[PDB]
Structures are given as C-alpha cells and as structure tokens.
Write a protein that binds this ligand. Structure first.
Ligand SMILES: [Zn+2]
Length: 245
C-alpha cells in the first residue's frame, strides 16, 4: 500500500490498481498511475525530469507489468511534460492537448532565446538547452477533449477552462469515480500565477462538479473527496477578490 522508492519518490495505493507516485523533493508533486483491466497502464502527469521519470517507469515495469503504457500530459509545465523524453524512450504513447504542445514549444523557444542573450559559458549553455522537455507525440483538440477506451474501460480527458494554466486538463476514470484535477486543484493557496487565469478559475473549477468524483487528486499534496473542488473555488474566489480581477 505504501512504498519508499529511490530518488526520494514514494508510491501510495489509493484504490485497487491505482497509485499516486510522489516526489518528496519537489513539494510533494503527484503523478497518477492506474492499471486498466486489459493490462494498459495510464500515467497522468509526470515527474519534473529524466531521473524521476525513469525511476517511476522502472517501478511501473516491476510492479504492474503493463501490456502497454499511455501517458497523459495535464499541462505544459515540467510536471506535465517533464516525463515525455523518458516515456517516449520506453515506447509509451504520450498524449496532450494541441495547446499544451504549442505552449511547450513556445516556452522552449523563449528559453533558447534567453540562453543566447545570457550564457558566456558554452559548455553550460548546451546543457540547459539539452535539459528542455519535449511535447507529447499525440494531440487532441483542447476544447473537445479525448475519451480513451481500453477494452470498454473509459478514461476521459477534459478541459474545464483556464485556471492554473491556459491549457490545463483533468482526467476522469468513471468506473472508479476518480478525478485527477492536477494543478487546478488548490485547496489552500493558488501557488504560481505566471501562467494562471485567476479570473476564470472559479468557473473552471465549478465545471469539475459535473464529475461524480469520489476521489479528487491534486497536483501536489494530499487528495480528498468532492470537497477538494469546493475548497479550490473558495481559494480562487478569495484571490479574485483580493487582486480585483
Ligand atoms: Zn503548472
């Protein structure tokens, strides 16, 4: 039910065949790992970089013996796209919205530009550009979302509107009534606002109530029930009020 892994990762069982894998160095960041009845393992979000992702994938190999792996990017930030390089190297099928891929490409370019203006050390410069994440191989139109069927078992990817980021999506598992809300679930404080649409956040979070969720999993920290959505709306609304948005 709970294991300590190398690289300060943990894996915690939350339901039959469903685990949350967490990086304790990176503010208790959450990755969902769910095994379908047909042997498919679905991974939602990612660790920030290659060593974390490879550790995760090795744990999946040893404990889940997947017939196939499908990874779904929640948004363009590193906790979302940081695993794509390693997922792909392992032959996993990586998915995101079109907008997520677009913003990841834009962000890489912005960074390459800044690296050009800044770095005098040529050895270092190559190492940072080399550290860039890649987008997913497979893409869906953000607003229509995507429904996977794994031998009749459904996994729904859905855009409730912009919140933590312009492209943030959630993943719902209707059989187990499990919602991975990721970084748009913020029960106490909103965190990083650089890419956020705080004005839209209350409405976007309200849309998550359309899911009959028994468990809601956030991008960081403990999960909970449907009340995780309620708490997020109050948090977002407080921020809208404070910031006059
Ligand atoms: Zn983020």
């Amino acid at each position: 039910d709970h294991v300590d892994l190398p690289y300060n990762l943990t894996a915690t069982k939350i339901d039959s065949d469903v685990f949350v894998v967490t990086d304790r160095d990176f503010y208790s960041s959450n990755v969902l790992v769910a095994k379908m009845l047909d042997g498919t393992v679905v991974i939602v979000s990612s660790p920030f970089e290659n060593l974390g992702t490879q550790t995760l994938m090795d744990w999946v190999a040893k404990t889940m013996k997947p017939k196939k792996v499908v990874a779904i990017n929640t948004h363009f930030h590193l906790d979302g796209t940081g695993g794509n390089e390693i997922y792909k190297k392992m032959g996993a099928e990586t998915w995101s919205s079109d907008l997520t891929k677009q913003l990841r490409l834009e962000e890489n370019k912005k960074d390459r530009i800044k690296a050009a203006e800044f770095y005098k050390n040529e050895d270092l410069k190559r190492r940072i550009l080399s550290s860039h994440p890649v987008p997913a191989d497979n893409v869906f139109d953000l607003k229509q979302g995507k429904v996977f069927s794994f031998s009749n078992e459904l996994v729904e990817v859905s855009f409730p509107g912009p919140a933590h980021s312009p492209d943030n999506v959630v993943v719902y598992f209707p059989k187990k009534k499990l919602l991975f809300g990721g970084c748009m679930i913020k029960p106490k404080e909103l965190g990083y606002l650089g890419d956020a649409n705080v004005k839209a956040w209350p409405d976007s979070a309200r849309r998550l109530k359309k899911f009959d969720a028994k468990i809601v999993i956030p991008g960081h920290g403990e999960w909970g029930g449907p009340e995780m959505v309620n708490k997020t709306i109050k948090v977002a609304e407080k921020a809208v009020g404070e910031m006059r948005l």
